[PDB]
Specification:
The structure is cut from a larger assembly and holds three copies of chain A.
Chain A (H helix, E strand, L loop, with lengths): L2 H5 L9 E2 L6 E6 L3 H4 L11 E2 L12 E6 L15 E3 L8 E2 L31 E5 L8 E4 L2 H19 L5 H17 L4 H15 L5 E2 L2 E3 L10 H4 L4 H13 L5 E3 L3 H9 L5 H10 L2 E4 L13 H9 L12 E2 L14 H7 L4 E3 L16 E4 L5 E5 L19 H5 L10 E2 L13 H11 L8 E2 L5 H11 L27 H19 L15 H11 L14 H7 L2 H13 L35 E4 L6 E5 L12 E6 L16 E2 L6 E3 L9 E3 L9 E3 L2 E2 L10 E9 L5 E8 L6 E4 L6 E4 L13 E2 L3 E5 L3 E8 L3 E4 L3 E8 L11 E7 L2 E4 L5 H4 L32 E8 L6 E7 L7 E2 L8 E4 L14 E2 L4 E7 L1
Helix pairs in contact in A: 3-4, 4-5, 15-18
PDB class: hydrolase
Keywords: cvt cargo, mannosidase, selective autophagy, hydrolase
Entry title: Structure of the S. cerevisiae alpha-mannosidase 1
Chain lengths: 940, 940, 67
């Protein structure tokens, strides 16, 4: 059918010319800054040397600079020709043509790329290019030219490619075939006069339901990944330069940036001439900042304060010369989404959101891609969702009509959605031939509006103007309550808990000193008292490791050591330095000060004797048998049984072997008890397994009301040895029947069933959590507190916490070494149903005691008339510039009770203020809605 | 859905043990026979040296021998273990464990392979292995073991693979998944006791419409290909040895051999102990010789004599100790099939045929794969046709149920057809795990006959017993007249005509001396006279280059030089030596002898003046205008216009560029004339093209009845230069309307239309021919004689001959160099309609004249009373052992007239005898059927 | 490949529907008789009845020879 005759023939087979200049070429390498090397160039004879040939290398962390001094050949003849220099793209680097140094040019784009030499100025210039190693040898040759001949070659390549994508039943496929025919006729027998003429004839063969197809070129950059931050800091400057050279070459282009800190990275590295580059670039057009967010992160693990700073400290750039923005919120690589996001968005002045994964196309009780998200708070979020092709559809895309068809099926709207650029790497490239892409697509389809029109230059702001018109304001709409569920690729989330232990301890610790440091305002006045400039710098370093890829611990071994480096550590070390600092001139009013933040036995007979409860491990079995309440009457049989099953997948996802029996840790145990006291009781029982390894958990608790508490504390200490690729968990089967699982999400409590959605794919079902998870019919249940482990699962009502994971990924630090784990099991009652939530989250508190000399009185309870047990205040902090402070509260128990808010203060005034710390004229609500975040601001 | 959970997990992940013996290992290389190197081993210190490590190499025609002397480790412990030695397969070589030399062992099998060490004899032996280079470095390590553990690993690998092939809708897919589940359970945690036990449990999970699925392991070897004959002569001995070691390991196995000469190759190389190996091997069972043919060749290009010898001289082995045979005829790689094959088969005592390509599945006026072939002669041929999967379906096949489904659709029968082994390479391998393959397929499906039974041990002889029963004897059956048509991959058929020029001239030349050398029988008696032993050796060398791959000229450059070597040349040189030899004592009865075999002008006014016809080239145009008959009244406008179009494909197929304009050779020509005479007239007209090259054709003819002949002779001489990848043709448009094209096939004239079948795929349509092709409404037409070009095409009635082709294949000798071409154009009439056929074929005759001293009378016409113009006798020759001679005739004009045969002789008797030269009791027919080959034998 | 294809002939009768109970009471006796004539004609046949009261309906209407 002549299918392989037209397609594979001409696609393979003045005009393009290749000249070679061997001399004047220099090479440089550092085996030990662009401004530092410019002074080391002209002076004497340094490591800069003549290359003139291909330079091989070997694996190193070193970077290799390269210098090419080119003299323009002849005068007029080769000037009209297009000047070009081809380079082989290495792992990283930069390219410059500095005098002395004005420019910064793009590198990080794909292995194929073009560098244009200015035809405006006739003379000799210089070139500075470095190549990051990880080895990749560069192929460098000068390439002259024509533009019209190469255009036809590209247009034909995108022609026949579009012929294959078009339906064979349509006449267009037979048309495009005949179009690929006539072109091949004059193209074959090597004729320049025919090629240029045939290009004109092809255009004549080209030009002879309201819908729209658009796209926005973007670069998604991970600040920490298998390449480090310092190296990727050089990678982000390559993303800006590719646009700058594209602007003069092509107009109407659109770029978006998920990092507000990206601006600062460029302003710190290139403060001089590139601060004045951004202003005409951003203000006029062609640039948009999405979300104005300081960090792109997973929202499940951290608190709302992490989401509070990124909005506020990312809005700080708006105070500088900046501020052309968009209403879209972009978290493409983020796994999972919080249920408080619809509430956080509207308050942050951002009305749109984008989600890559976590969706399906079918009747789900859900129509399509485009979606209006209604959280459990009751608020609504209009969000724009890309199809199942994700962001890799338009990434490095020359295929034209290929994914255009697959985009139309999931989406209805009046139009589709395309995201240009790659989100996997040091940063995404932006192709320079996109100008022809938009043009050649306007060659196939006619102009005027009848058939869908092709415009790549439209902005999402105008796109959101279209959705406000076509579709109704709505009452009954696409509706999904809570979060979304698809293949999560949880992976490292529960793996390498040691980086969580450091972070989660640093999380609370940095969240510790915040508010109380504003309570010393009255004591010693200067600015009064608050580490405004001091704590601002603190949040700068912490948010850097909190990114979506970095925080769970999925990365190479090099940057993983930078996670356990002072980056995480010194934060705790500086905060523990400040907490011992501010105390000196403060606590001096305290003789003996207990510092805590709030606002108002037997062996053979196997018993630990007390009133509250009883939990018993059988003899020689090693497994807890009876957990039973006398007053309640609930008896348990199948507790705390540790289970170890291997893992055969990589760091990304988790895939267990087919029907693999999980090895129990039960063995010929021995019995022991740590101490002897009414205050302290710890009974020790040893567990062992094949390839002997010591797995230790501890038992701690306070009796009743001599010790006082309602909850046990069980901490696990395990030093891993030998066998890798294993996944360890501890089971807490409730032996109870409930279709609902109580779990506390970020700023609230979400309601999720015991069984996953019927559309679920992956066998293994695990859920990420903050602190505790419960099962409650409201008259009773079982509550499980935990530390350093964010994961858990619903087994058919068997509570299983994930202690450790060891992926087969190329990381050797995820396998062996000691670990300190902690968790708990708590008895549940209807009266204690609101108590278990209160005794869970903030239990991470660490007791600390210190005393100065005595002059004063140390008892002051300064909080004013609120007293709501159903509400919990997560964050209260100051401002930037005044020093007005903000107060943010959220209701713990919601969905049933309507919390009356009497919260107020004295000696000053108060007004309700959103999460962006921006002034809002409703006033303080006397009653809080269920599952509502209440944030306020305080002024003198 | 846990699809990638079960399939990709356990498939990747005493028992297998790897030991290393560095010492005692020797290596050898020849940079300059197995019997020659055995005397060079123990004596002194030769190039045989210690290796003990991996030996790298470089491109060479050399072979590298290798010696491993192994001592059995310990006594009992590692004896029970399976002894094995793994080698990396090179281009070619042999493997031996000689004492002194008994054995020959298999090598040529795939890169993975096993060599078993005998556990019967306890001691130390030697190993001799050579590696052919073309470089490939060998990896050699001793491997010990268990057999039960590895069996489960293979059975499981073929299990999950069968799970994917089975329909997901069926419960079998879900069953096999659960079967792959339970196995992975005990297999994962490294337990020998569990693996051996789980293997038993899996067998218990296995065992709990009449059809048959069978196959025969076979090796298709090309005697000359991209590797030469001398090197592949070592490759064929590796095919036999793989069976010999398989026989003791597994029974019921079946092997087939398309080469009868393959026996002789083994008997010449290994005459001593391997002559006694074949007799118990072939006679009992497990071996069958298909067709008993000396050569596997394309039947279109040569004459019937080439097909006559291969049957007869391949039946010579039957006279030795041999002769367990089959009725199947096998030409899998042969492109195209003759229409006389149904007649040739029944006479050769072979009733079945096999065809790979040239078929389609649809309603074609044709049901299925299985077919009863009715030739244009009227005879029927029952043939067995493999599906569209060809012979590569069961080739190297571990995939089990994969191609089992695709085999059932094209074929109905009661059963399908599978051909095991590869037909592409030096020779096909036969896998040793086929024993488990038949067994594991008997594990999935139960035993007894209900569902299709799996037997790989059945023979095609018994298979043809089944077809005689189930289906009817038949009247109306699958019917296809003439040849078959699918993608031909004509390719080199018209390319490199120089190897055709040598062969076609050698064809007739070897076909020349045959019969007349029996006419001198009476002259000088000893045996009387005939080169019985002399001409027998002649046909030995000639048939060697006549194979299907070798003859068209598709091959590497090395063996291509061996085509133009004395192999083709000396045949002509020896025959021209004998023709000048036998004449000396023969022609002496002739004073002056003309030796031929048979049985009874102007320029400016542009004219060559004579009576018969007129053919005129216009001035300055270079193109013939008017070819016109005065008596007939037919005028032609559009002759002999040479056309050059490029080619963008390889040697195999031919693919033109999409709508590429073919460049005409018309140019500013000049006029000239070779000689001046009534006997000799040649007018010269020059043609030229871009990148100037001289394309010359000549004009020769004899006037009427001073010169006498009815036909022109035009010979083309072109020396190729510069541009490659071109395809040259000369057009002879008839300017006439006919739906039928007259063409003379091998032994007859087939009838083919002007348009290809409606099921045809490839655009370009070209036909292979012997000598001439005509277009006749029987009152008139145009006849085209040609030489050295077997190709032509039907353009809508434009006659186009293919002068030369230059493929892009890795052969540099198909591009440039001079060529001598010849063809003709003949006027057609109803009375001359039988004349044109007679003046076409044998015109290749070359005039030769020589004279001795004079005593005698030189005129004798010895032929006795036949005189049939519609019949033509192609071959008459002698026998093997007596020296009785045979006479074979065939009717040229058939389909209309019934030829009365009065053919007989005197002084002796005559009986009808088939193509195998075997005695047949109907007698000499008085009348010959249309399109019938009549062969007879003569006795004293 | 071990597999089995079976079935059981059954009659699902609604005691009250677009036709009344008194009329369908005559309809249930037609379900039993079709089996009785089938038993002698063909063996191994299987019938099932979702109504235990179906027995009583037959025993009340035909108490004598059909018990």
């Amino acid at each position: 059918x002549x299918x392989x005759x037209x397609x594979x023939x001409x696609x393979x087979x003045k005009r393009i010319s290749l000249d070679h200049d061997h001399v004047k070429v220099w090479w440089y390498q550092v085996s030990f800054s662009w401004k530092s090397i410019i002074e080391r160039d002209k002076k004497g004879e340094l490591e800069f040397r003549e290359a003139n040939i291909n330079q091989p290398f070997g694996p190193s962390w070193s970077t290799t600079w390269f210098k090419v001094k080119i003299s323009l050949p002849e005068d007029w003849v080769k000037s009209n020709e297009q000047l070009l220099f081809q380079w082989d793209c290495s792992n990283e680097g930069i390219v410059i043509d500095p005098k002395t140094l004005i420019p910064v040019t793009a590198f990080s784009g794909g292995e194929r790329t073009e560098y244009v030499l200015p035809k405006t100025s006739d003379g000799k210039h210089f070139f500075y290019i470095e190549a990051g190693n990880n080895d990749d040898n560069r192929f460098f040759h000068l390439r002259k030219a024509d533009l019209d001949a190469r255009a036809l070659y590209i247009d034909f390549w995108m022609l026949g490619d579009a012929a294959r994508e078009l339906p064979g039943d349509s006449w267009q496929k037979h048309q495009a075939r005949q179009l690929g025919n006539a072109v091949m006729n004059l193209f074959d027998p090597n004729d320049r006069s025919s090629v240029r003429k045939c290009r004109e004839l092809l255009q004549r063969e080209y030009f002879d339901v309201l819908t729209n197809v658009y796209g926005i070129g973007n670069c998604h950059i991970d600040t920490a990944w298998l390449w480090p931050f310092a190296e990727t800091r050089r990678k982000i400057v390559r993303s800006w330069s590719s646009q700058c050279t594209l602007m003069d070459r092509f107009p109407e282009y659109k770029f978006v940036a998920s990092q507000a800190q990206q601006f600062k990275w460029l302003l710190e590295d290139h403060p001089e001439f590139f601060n004045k580059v951004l202003i005409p670039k951003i203000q006029q057009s062609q640039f948009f900042a999405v979300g104005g967010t300081w960090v792109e992160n997973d929202t499940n693990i951290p608190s709302g304060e992490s989401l509070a700073r990124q909005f506020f400290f990312g809005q700080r750039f708006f105070l500088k010369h900046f501020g052309l923005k968009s209403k879209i919120f972009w978290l493409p690589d983020t796994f999972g989404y919080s249920s408080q996001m619809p509430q956080l968005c509207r308050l942050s002045g951002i009305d749109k959101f984008l989600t890559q994964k976590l969706s399906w196309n079918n009747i789900n009780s859900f129509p399509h891609s485009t979606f209006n998200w209604a959280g459990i708070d009751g608020s609504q979020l209009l969000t724009h969702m890309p199809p199942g092709n994700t962001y890799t559809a338009d990434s490095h895309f020359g295929d034209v009509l290929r994914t255009a068809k697959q985009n139309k099926t999931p989406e209805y709207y009046g139009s589709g959605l395309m995201l240009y650029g790659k989100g996997d790497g040091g940063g995404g490239p932006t192709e320079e031939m996109l100008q022809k892409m938009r043009r050649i697509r306007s060659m196939n389809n006619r102009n005027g509006n009848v058939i869908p029109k092709l415009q790549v230059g439209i902005t999402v702001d105008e796109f959101y103007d279209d959705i406000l018109k076509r579709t109704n304001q709505g009452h009954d709409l696409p509706t999904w309550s809570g979060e979304l569920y698809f293949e999560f690729h949880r992976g490292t989330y529960t793996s390498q808990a040691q980086t969580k232990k450091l972070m989660r301890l640093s999380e609370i610790k940095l969240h510790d000193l915040e508010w109380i440091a504003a309570k010393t305002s009255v004591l010693y006045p200067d600015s009064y008292k608050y580490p405004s400039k001091q704590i601002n710098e603190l949040w700068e370093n912490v948010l850097l490791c909190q990114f979506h890829d970095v925080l769970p611990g999925s990365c190479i071994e090099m940057v993983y050591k930078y996670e356990a480096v002072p980056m995480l550590h010194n934060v705790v070390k500086e905060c523990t330095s400040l907490i011992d600092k501010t105390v000196q001139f403060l606590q001096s009013q305290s003789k003996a000060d207990l510092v805590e933040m709030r606002t108002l036995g037997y062996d053979d007979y196997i018993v630990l004797a007390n009133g509250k409860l009883k939990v018993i491990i059988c003899k020689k079995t090693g497994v807890i048998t009876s957990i039973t309440d006398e007053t309640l009457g609930v008896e348990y049989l199948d507790f705390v049984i540790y289970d170890d099953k291997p893992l055969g997948w990589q760091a990304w996802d988790t895939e267990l072997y087919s029907v693999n029996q999980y090895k129990y840790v039960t063995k010929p145990k021995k019995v022991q008890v740590s101490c002897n006291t009414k205050e302290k009781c710890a009974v020790e029982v040893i567990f062992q397994i094949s390839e002997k390894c010591k797995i230790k958990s501890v038992i701690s608790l306070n009796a009743t009301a001599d010790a006082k508490l309602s909850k046990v504390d069980i901490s696990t200490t395990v030093e891993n040895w030998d066998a890798r690729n294993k996944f360890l968990k501890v089971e807490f089967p409730v032996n109870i029947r409930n279709d609902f699982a109580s779990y506390e999400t970020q700023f609230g409590i979400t309601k999720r069933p015991t069984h996953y959605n019927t559309s679920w794919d992956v066998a293994k079902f695990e859920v990420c959590h903050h602190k505790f998870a419960d099962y409650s019919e409201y008259s009773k249940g079982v509550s499980i507190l935990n530390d350093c482990k964010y994961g858990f699962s619903t087994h058919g009502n068997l509570m299983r916490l994930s202690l450790l994971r060891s992926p087969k990924a190329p990381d050797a630090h995820a396998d062996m070494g000691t670990h300190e784990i902690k968790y708990a099991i708590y008895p549940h009652r209807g009266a204690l149903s609101s108590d278990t939530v209160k005794l869970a989250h903030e239990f991470n508190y660490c007791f600390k005691y210190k005393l100065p000399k005595d002059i004063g009185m140390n008892f002051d309870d300064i909080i004013s008339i609120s007293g709501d047990e159903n509400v919990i205040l997560s964050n209260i902090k100051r401002g930037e510039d005044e020093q007005s402070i903000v107060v943010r509260v959220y209701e713990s128990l919601g969905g049933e009770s309507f919390a009356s808010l009497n919260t107020t203060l004295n000696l000053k005034r108060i007004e309700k203020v959103d999460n962006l710390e921006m002034k809002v004229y409703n006033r303080i609500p006397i009653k809080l809605r269920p599952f509502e975040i209440a944030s306020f601001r305080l002024y003198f």
